[PDB]
Design a protein around this ligand. Structure first.
Ligand SMILES: [Zn+2]
Lengths: 105, 312, 148, 49
């Protein structure tokens, strides 16, 4: 209950899941009927934008490093949104560390 | 999640499948497979008309196996309309189930006890039941037959004299049939369940449809003191690997810090030397290596969207 | 070019492709299980491409393997769902009537009643829930370090 | 929070613990890079144990 949840992508309701077993970890979103499927490699993400907790809107956006690619998601429950955000924070942070080390060396 | 949640779900599934008809299973199963479910979505999931859905929801609501939640919604493109959501409040359903199971068992036990008492009497004409005590005082002068009051007619002995065993069989069957419910309740009592709410249920939501009109979000009105009945319920780690070059670099930084550290306590120059005589104040190896390598090689050879946002 | 037609390059043949490729109770059972949502599969489409469906569906209904929605004009199978629970029929009609007869008390009083009988109530009364100067030439340099 | 590591310390960890080396040789480099492994290792419960 910390790697899956309901989310809305491009005005389409679906289930958002975090797949960490396969390296690199990628964010996969699937529609309820399975017609639409979206996959994003977390290694390409540069920053993680999230709406403030003081606003009724509950969007979470990931921006890819370079017309940079932008992925936006909307959730339903703040607890689900926060739980996904905390997990995503760990993945993005580690990949950023690897990028710094790779360029540093 | 938690093992208890499955136990509660299993108890609900058995109760609905046994003590209710067929369509009831479909409605409750859909609302158990998913979290809070909009009425419109529920209709199309089961493809049953609104009129048929009414009896199912109403009876389930009456037994408190399903809870209701109405909130005002403001679609960006259409006039506001009130939406109805259905979910399961486990404390409510378990509480209702526990009482009903006890009542049914108690009723049979009381009925079984009642059948063990004398039969009684009744009047065929006025269909008025008379107890043994009441019939004794209405007998005739000859004291041969009981007489009715309204009709003044002989009474007839009542039935149920042969049911002493039938009711015992009825109680025996129900206890054996209802075994899984008690076993589930026993495990439920051992654990502690948290009361569910419309917002809480949304955490486990599985969207029913692709473009459902109903917004499965709970945006409570800002700072509202109104209270409705039955609507309230009870850091990053980075690691840097230091090599030999970095180790000496850290030593140089530490040495610089030590040099600056003493300065804050170092005495000034005025303080050091007595200043009375001064003025006033104011106003090639590489080639040798290659031949060695060639020579040693010979030796080896020889030897071998603009919205407010924050950065998280 | 159509989607409901299947081509066979081995013999150069066109076949009537069906929405659901099920021709056995095992295939139907797994298809219902694989569903990610509780949207039943139409029996109108299930019948197409399969000679008999009512006979197979009826047997599964007796076995309590699937849930079947039947019409009202006459018993005819419609949209079906996988049975995640136990036996569909496990309570005698004489006890269902008794369950119908029993009427629950007011919810605000039900938890109290169970405690009287010695049964632990998994609920609480909603009424018990409680809601819960000089030197002005430093206009903004002075930070309020009131507490430590 | 930052933690400093050195190759001499890295070798010491392998020598004093064979489980860490076992999960290091069969993973680095096949799926990801060494720096992520140690950050992954420290955040794991194996390091705590
Ligand atoms: Zn009479």
């Amino acid at each position: 209950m910390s790697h899956s949840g309901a989310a809305i992508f491009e005005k389409v309701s679906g289930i958002i899941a975090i797949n960490e077993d396969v390296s690199p970890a990628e964010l996969t979103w699937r529609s309820t009927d399975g017609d639409k499927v979206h996959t994003v490699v977390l290694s390409t993400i540069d920053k993680l934008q999230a709406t403030p907790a003081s606003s009724e809107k509950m969007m979470l956006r990931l921006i890819g490093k370079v017309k940079p690619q932008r992925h936006m998601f909307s959730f339903n429950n703040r607890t689900v949104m926060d739980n996904i955000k905390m997990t995503l924070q760990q993945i993005i942070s580690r990949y950023k560390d690897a990028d710094i080390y790779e360029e540093k060396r | 999640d938690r093992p208890i949640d499955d136990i509660v779900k299993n108890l609900l599934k058995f109760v609905v499948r046994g003590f209710y008809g067929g369509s009831f299973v479909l409605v409750l199963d859909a609302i158990l497979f998913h979290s809070v479910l909009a009425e419109d979505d529920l209709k199309q999931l089961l493809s049953i008309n609104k009129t048929e859905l009414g009896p199912l929801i109403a009876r389930l609501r009456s037994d408190r196996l399903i809870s209701i939640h109405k909130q005002r919604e403001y679609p960006p493109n259409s006039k506001s309309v009130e939406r109805v959501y259905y979910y399961v409040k486990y404390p409510h359903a378990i509480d209702a189930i526990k009482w009903k199971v006890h009542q049914v068992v108690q009723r049979l036990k009381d009925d079984l006890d009642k059948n063990s008492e004398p039969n009684g009497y009744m009047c065929p004409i006025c269909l008025t039941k008379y107890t043994q005590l009441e019939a004794v005082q209405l007998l005739n002068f000859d004291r041969t037959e009981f007489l009715c009051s309204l009709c003044d007619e002989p009474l007839v002995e009542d039935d149920s004299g042969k049911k002493n065993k039938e009711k015992q069989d009825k109680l025996n069957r129900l206890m054996d049939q209802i075994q899984p419910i008690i076993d589930s309740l026993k495990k439920i009592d051992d654990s502690r369940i948290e009361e569910n709410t419309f917002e809480i249920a949304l955490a486990r939501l599985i969207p029913p449809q692709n473009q459902s009109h109903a917004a499965y979000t709970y945006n409570p009105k800002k700072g509202s003191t109104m209270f409705r009945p039955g609507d309230s319920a009870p850091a990053t780690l980075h690691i840097n690997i230091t090599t030999a070059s970095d180790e000496v670099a850290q030593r140089e930084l530490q040495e610089r810090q030590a040099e600056e550290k003493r300065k804050q306590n170092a005495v000034p120059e005025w303080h050091k030397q007595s200043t009375i005589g001064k003025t006033a104040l104011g106003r090639e190896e590489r080639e040798n290596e290659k031949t060695l390598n060639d020579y040693y090689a010979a030796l080896a050879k020889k030897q071998a969207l603009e919205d407010e946002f924050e950065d998280v | 070019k159509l989607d409901r037609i299947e081509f066979d390059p081995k013999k150069g043949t066109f076949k009537y492709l069906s929405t659901y490729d099920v021709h056995s109770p095992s295939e139907l059972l797994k298809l219902l299980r694989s569903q990610v949502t509780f949207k039943g599969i139409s029996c109108k489409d299930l019948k197409d491409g399969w000679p008999q469906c009512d006979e197979t569906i009826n047997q599964l209904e007796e076995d309590s393997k699937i849930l079947v929605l039947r019409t009202k004009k006459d018993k005819t199978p419609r949209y079906v769902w996988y049975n995640s629970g136990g036996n569909l029929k496990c309570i005698d009609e004489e006890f269902v009537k008794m369950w119908e007869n029993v009427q629950l008390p007011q919810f605000a009083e039900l938890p109290r009643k169970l405690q009287d009988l010695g049964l632990k109530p998994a609920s609480v009364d909603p009424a018990t829930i409680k809601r819960q100067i000089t030197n002005t030439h430093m206009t903004g340099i002075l930070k309020d370090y009131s507490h430590r | 929070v930052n933690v400093n590591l050195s190759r001499e310390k890295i070798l010491n960890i392998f020598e004093n613990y064979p489980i860490v080396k076992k999960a290091y040789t069969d993973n680095v480099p096949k799926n990801f890079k060494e720096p992520e492994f140690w950050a992954r290792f420290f955040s794991s419960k194996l390091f705590r144990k």
